[PDB]
Symmetry: D2
Subunit: 213 residues, 4 copies
């Protein structure tokens, strides 16, 4: 199974997939039966905005990402999500700490290594407060409110190729936050491997972003 490491502790993993490039061809033609013409049809559909045939290609991913990344990701309503709960489980001590390279191009009056240090210090104090509240009998759903947005979470994501292409237009792009761009690059890599003709036609005719290819 295709698994890609993202950020310092995150990942994107392909759990399951239904269909391939030919599923979009079989659905568009409403074919009974189970190539230059099939590839030409994918390019035609892509070129002219006939995107419904790509809805018959479905992916299930397992993602580990910080909450501030998941908040942006979960705004994609045309998909399915199941995520770890802070109400029902004790949350793990796992936080996204930016690399000093994250601040490249930014003049800071604090050294980038000291930025890294200050982020680590506050997440350690917040996690210590969280544990002290839990261990004192405070319910989990209340104790977790002191935890910061760089806490890692995990979720299952089921999405079809049309909504995935919308996600790549918006997230595999320089306007999107750098951290979610890194997840979108991995999603694109998996999409390219499972659906080469759809992905190549998407980049050529319909992809709106500025980082892919």
């Amino acid at each position: 199974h295709m698994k890609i490491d993202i950020l310092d502790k995150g990942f994107v993993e392909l759990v399951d997939v239904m269909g391939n490039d030919l599923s979009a061809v079989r659905a568009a033609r409403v074919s009974f039966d189970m190539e230059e013409r099939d590839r030409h049809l994918i390019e035609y559909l892509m070129k002219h905005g006939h995107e419904t045939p790509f809805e018959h290609i479905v992916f299930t991913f397992h993602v580990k990402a910080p909450i501030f990344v998941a908040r942006q990701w979960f705004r994609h309503r045309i998909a399915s999500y199941n995520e770890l709960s802070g109400r029902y489980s004790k949350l793990s001590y796992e936080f996204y700490i930016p690399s000093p390279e994250r601040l490249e191009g930014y003049k800071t009056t604090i050294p980038p290594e000291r930025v890294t240090e200050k982020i680590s210090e506050i997440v350690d104090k917040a996690y210590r407060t969280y544990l002290e509240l839990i261990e004192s009998g405070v319910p989990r759903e209340v104790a977790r409110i002191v935890l910061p947005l760089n806490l890692y979470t995990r979720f299952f994501w089921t999405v079809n190729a049309r909504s995935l292409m919308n996600f790549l237009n918006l997230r595999a792009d320089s306007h999107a936050q750098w951290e979610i761009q890194q997840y979108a690059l991995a999603i694109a890599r998996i999409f390219k491997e499972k659906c080469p003709w759809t992905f190549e036609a998407f980049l050529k005719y319909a992809y709106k972003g500025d980082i892919l290819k």
Copy 2:
């Protein structure tokens, strides 16, 4: 592949499926790893309305049905469709003719065999007019407007198990038109075979209709 004959000339065929009962278990727990407890969890989810885990189970069907059946079916917006076009193709001489048994329980002043005959006569005249218009150079998208609602159509339908359960609540039920009930019974049969635990839990705790089991 599971294929079921419906009405006089229709069918329901399973084209593809992603996941099974355990997909709903793996998504709900956000499991890394790939049974009495798993079956108990499905029943708990079903019993308490936690339906999002069943969205990770996805089906693709190939359906041949009359247009009046497809019009009701296509009202289910939480799914994907690709259908044959009367604008782009010459439509086939294939119509749904009710069996004389379709009128059981109805007192008619015309014999049920003569009802069958009158339906056949008008669809033959309409199809003859359609062909005369086509053969005279009338564009297909205009010529087909004389064709009746019992004309057979075909489509690909991609739907997840949660939306499929909503479809079974509404269509595998005595309030739904008898013709779509027959398609819903076949969809239920395929759903039961691919997801036995989800289907049994659905019938026991969440199914709202009055014909299944």
Copy 3:
């Protein structure tokens, strides 16, 4: 209330509306408080694909259209529909008969007036068969299957400005069937009147079709 006649017997009527251009501005800024900058923001959102603020503008239309037009229209899943039922009511003798001008640009071996005549003759025979079945005790849901696709239907349509813009890209365009193009032109007229800044920005930066303006 804005009402527009379409085809020979159809119409588009605006029933209700929530919001205006400023609703998209108030939502995008998450404003507490209730113009060159506001118009500039609409153009920026439109230009860069930030379409979610336009979802806060909602319309309700009352449409009378032939079934073959409604079948294309009802494929727009991101909206709400309520339509007249052939199961529950006796259907009216009202059919779309194309004007002889509908065949302009098509060489026909039958005069365009005789095309009009042949369409009228078959819909009259089909409606007569429908009435004979109803009057003989055949249930309505079965009797109506002989009725042709140019039968008029009516529905309520609730749709937000973002999904409406998607509908205008696809239906107010030469690739769409001429009959639904005529309904989309009327929808565009109503949209322009209620949301002038959004409509002008849509035409300038995001509209994909080839007939508007």
Copy 4:
């Protein structure tokens, strides 16, 4: 405009509304024209699960809530959202601090007043770190990752009465976190005021929760 205070610093405000109880009646009947029978029809629709007519009633709310509440709320995909951004704006020093009464029924080995104190102390240190990072030139989208989940956010929410009833079934209920229950009680109050017949029929026949009425 109906505005309700929630928690220590939050609120729910009705911004706009389209339609009323009669909109669900006018849509269900597809009425041209603009009461015991109308109220009976609402109860019938509610009783038998014919929920699509209530989609023609649409609300726009302005909500101020902590992020952990907004994360649960934003899982309701059949709606529209526009929220304040931590990427684009400097975030305000406003946090949800639970009242000592929030821990009623829980035996804690730390006094409930000291729980309140420990939550305030860590959010003050996190906000101070956030400001130090911002003032040192760290981009906002990175600096805000140290901020905790009880930070207040604000958003516009456009939702129709059917999706709102689903939200009330799940959130105006004892299984939902107490904090979002308080927002759902205010949403219910606004819904009852604008749609009295729909709300009363909802409570009697379709409401699944255990706190309303």
